[PDB]
Design a protein around this ligand. Structure first.
Ligand SMILES: N=[N+]=NCCOCCOCCOCCNC(=O)c1ccc(S(=O)(=O)Nc2cc(F)cc3c(=O)cc(C(=O)NCC4CCCCC4)oc23)cc1
Ligand SMILES: N=[N+]=NCCOCCOCCOCCNC(=O)c1ccc(S(=O)(=O)Nc2cc(F)cc3c(=O)cc(C(=O)NCC4CCCCC4)oc23)cc1
Ligand SMILES: N[C@@H](CCCC[NH3+])C(=O)O
Ligand SMILES: N[C@@H](CCCC[NH3+])C(=O)O
Lengths: 496, 497
């Protein structure tokens, strides 16, 4: 690009001529929002020539109306201010008017000094005496924005697209709301390690790395569960953690291998308590943001249809196995993890043209059948409940239903948002389920985790009856901000 | 251990007999702190037989005073309550008194139901009618806390040691205080990626991993700086991020390869602004926690001496080069990155018995000389300022001092707490500094980073004049909580197996 090489040449020329070259410090009189709050409502043509102010922002527009008069727009902290540069007001000690303004381009970060007020046409303005080039833009900027450029050059998206800045402000506001809710209930916010000898607490492949000091391979965490439960053994009673987890899987509209999860553990809660809390927390946050529990969603982007998501509580419950059996029009075989039921579920996947998992474990077949028959019914927030033990190695046995657990998932628009259960606190069964998971792993289940003897020893010290819970923060922001691509709610998503 | 196998046998016997086996839900009437607040001021011997309450906690003490009378202490949410179990009050529908209490051991998580009040001796008590075993402890618990066990089995440390629970509560309190300070200034809290094609923004070896979907090697971040600065190009004006960084270095009292850093970027700040902010933020937090700016520290653990750290402002400033030259009694050679000055610094290291770095770059030699002559003077919070450009590839040239930058580090008790500068926003020099870093890396500098063309392209879109800043959260908690081992302020530090 000629424009880039020429801009480097003009900056070298400015430097050699002893003209202002990347000043270290520009002292603003006030922010552009403060400027608009103070002067935004003066009458048309108002000027205070007794007040000189310094303002700064990025140039969004330059219009030289005449040889004597240049109009700028500058933008900073979500406020536009017009700058009116009249040759008659120009401070010639900064250079000749034409020379000073010839150094400025659209996209440059600049300072101005001048008098406040409003143009005769009613535009909030600074009537400038000087212009200082603080940091030039070496590229011709589009006038507006190509999802690929938006994600690979996120600074361009944020510079040019108000909608993008709104999503990240909403993300921060939602995380703050969630911390406030738990902090006021007396929860302790904690950090657990991201690099560990073992990994577990979800069904995903890990990232693997090497630690020079410990001279060992380590795994990045796929979840926080196994460490957070140790803090409940430790008596901290109520803990939460919001942070990154690393699942070495696919990239698509709803998956980013690196993503933000929240988990909390509450001593003395069961999964019934956690369903009520999920409804209160999420409906409260939706109300705070939207002013009602019925909110818009564009499942095919903003050029597509608009649907309504209804967060009115209480939410629909679907029983995992019963809803599959309704879909199939016949019963799964018992026990659910019998070879008989594995063969039957393979037959049902073939009959209903459901892609088979590998390996063909009872757990992975149940998951495929749920995906086809149950998750697809979950448009409004819906709980899928009472998952089989065989697919829920850390969930406590159901107090009424053989082979099931006290588990739920929250689904919105067919996507998982939450996963929660009455925690398994019985170490004999826990060890058995970990051995079964390790067997599935050794048979080629790349999503099954190795045994964690440190965790089993922690359970042997007595985990109180406990309820635990996870939330996908990125997926939450997708619904709250109405984005159908997870890359919209992550500042720098990893790209090909 | 016989004790563990026998406890598994007792639980199997309970299960087979149809007796309570890991109840799913115990409904407490109120927390133990709420119980103490409600009944803590009744007169000695008060009992309300008209009120039945359910309480739960971990058994810290069992004393069978007689065949008819058992005293328990339970603990939950930082409150102890005594349970008085008299055979005459026992609910026989839960089993015979002897059978019900025979199932309970020190360390068990249990529920009790009973009448509230106070023993004749004045002890806050529940006069129990029933006991339920909720989650047994299969191990004989030590009566008190070994560092190794405390770190490998943190649940035992937290269960038995109030001082350990206090450290983690103080850590959460300090992080909340810091978020509040920046949130009230209009900062946006952000998340930037931990797994990237490139790494940069500090001087450390990286962790390496492999991404299945992208079919590529990636690095874990060593810092957040290069992404956060792009958000200031993006016009977000004030951003911060508190999160993990991964530096594939040593483990010692003040280093954990995985640790928590905070970075912030403020448009239109310079390093003078950031020194004043550092003083206000840190002195404010110390005052909030301690009620003064002079706080105790045990540099050799609690059996050793106690010193005082004084956070009173203004903090001492040491100029990097001038303080080295005071130490040497003579001047470094100019330019600082000349072979002449490299040879001279090697001669000075040999003269003063300072261990040489490898490779012998101007930057690494300057660092060794600072470590010997300047960092050692930093007991109270002290700013080391105006670092040479050659060791500061992302710091803007000093507006007054040739070859220096607008940089500071904050040191406390000779340890780095903060690193900050007027940000370099001139892309020609930036590219040159990155090329010099890549050269140092190819010459054997394992702490020098590869060039980041994505970052250079971002600078070509115009980074406003900016001030940026990093803080080691763990090291801050070490000073605030008076711990001399970083493993004291990290819940689960990774240990040798
Ligand atoms: N092409 N090519 N070339 C290379 C050859 O291919 C090799 C690589 O294959 C990739 C294809 O993989 C297919 C098989 N794998 C899966 O189908 C799979 C999907 C999801 C999962 S997951 O663990 O249940 N979930 C998640 C996994 C993930 F990577 C990202 C997210 C995420 O961004 C958000 C959430 C979330 O917010 N979920 C909600 C929960 C709630 C409870 C707390 C945690 C979050 O969940 C996620 C596991 C496996
Ligand atoms: N035995 N054996 N086995 C195998 C053989 O051993 C091979 C391995 O060699 C180990 C020996 O390593 C010696 C060489 N390397 C260093 O000496 C070194 C030291 C520090 C650094 S560092 O990047 O400047 N700093 C930090 C690096 C680190 F790993 C942890 C921390 C930390 O826990 C906290 C802080 C902090 O709070 N610092 C403050 C800053 C402020 C600004 C923001 C960020 C934090 O800083 C840290 C880099 C290198
Ligand atoms: N670790 C779970 C979330 C918590 C489930 C209940 N303990 C997950 O990542 O899905
Ligand atoms: N990235 C730096 C902290 C910020 C320095 C100023 N931009 C470090 O880790 O030391």
């Amino acid at each position: 690009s000629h424009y880039t090489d020429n801009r480097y040449k003009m900056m070298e020329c400015i430097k050699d001529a002893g003209r202002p070259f990347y000043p270290h410090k520009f002292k603003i009189s006030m922010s552009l929002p403060a400027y608009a709050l103070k002067y935004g409502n003066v009458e048309n043509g108002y000027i205070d020539k007794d007040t000189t102010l310094s303002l700064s922002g990025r140039v969004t527009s330059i219009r030289s109306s005449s040889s004597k008069l240049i109009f700028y727009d500058i933008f900073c902290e979500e406020q536009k201010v017009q700058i009116i540069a009249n040759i008659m007001e120009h401070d010639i000690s900064t250079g000749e008017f034409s020379v000073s303004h010839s150094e400025i381009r659209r996209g440059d970060v600049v300072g101005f000094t001048g008098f406040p007020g409003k143009s005769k046409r009613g535009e909030l303005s600074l009537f400038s005496k000087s212009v200082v080039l603080l940091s030039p833009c070496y590229h011709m900027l589009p006038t507006a924005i190509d999802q690929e450029v938006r994600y690979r050059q996120r600074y361009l998206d944020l510079m040019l697209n108000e909608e993008s800045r709104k999503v990240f402000k909403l993300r921060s506001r939602a995380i703050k709301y969630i911390r406030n809710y738990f902090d006021r209930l007396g929860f302790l916010e904690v950090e657990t390690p991201m690099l560990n000898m073992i990994y577990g607490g979800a069904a995903a492949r890990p990232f693997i790395t090497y630690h020079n000091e410990l001279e060992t391979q380590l795994y990045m965490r796929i979840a926080t569960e196994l460490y957070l439960k140790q803090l409940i053994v430790g008596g901290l009673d109520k803990v939460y953690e919001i942070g990154k987890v690393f699942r070495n899987e696919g990239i698509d509209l709803t998956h980013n291998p690196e993503f933000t999860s929240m988990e909390f553990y509450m001593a003395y809660a069961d999964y019934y308590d956690l369903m009520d809390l999920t409804e209160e927390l999420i409906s409260g946050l939706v109300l705070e943001i939207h002013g009602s529990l019925k909110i818009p969603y564009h499942p095919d982007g903003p050029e597509g249809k608009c649907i309504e998501i209804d967060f009115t509580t209480p939410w629909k419950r679907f029983s995992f196995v019963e809803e599959i059996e309704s879909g199939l029009g016949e019963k799964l075989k018992r026990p659910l993890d019998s070879q008989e039921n594995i063969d039957f579920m393979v037959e049902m996947c073939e009959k209903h043209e459901i892609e088979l998992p590998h390996p063909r474990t009872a757990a992975k077949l149940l998951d495929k059948l749920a995906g086809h028959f149950v998750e697809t019914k979950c448009t409004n927030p819906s709980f899928i409940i009472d998952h089989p033990q065989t697919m829920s190695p850390l969930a406590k046995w159901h107090r009424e239903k053989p082979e099931m657990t006290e588990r739920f998932e929250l689904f919105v628009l067919g996507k998982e948002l939450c996963n929660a259960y009455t925690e398994l606190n019985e170490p004999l069964q826990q060890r058995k389920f970990f051995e079964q998971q390790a067997d599935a792993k050794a048979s080629g289940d790349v999503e099954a985790c190795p045994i964690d003897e440190t965790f089993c020893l922690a359970l042997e010290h007595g985990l109180p009856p406990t309820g635990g819970w996870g939330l996908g923060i990125d997926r939450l922001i997708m619904f709250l901000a109405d984005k159908n691509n997870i890359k919209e709610v992550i500042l720098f998503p990893a790209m090909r």
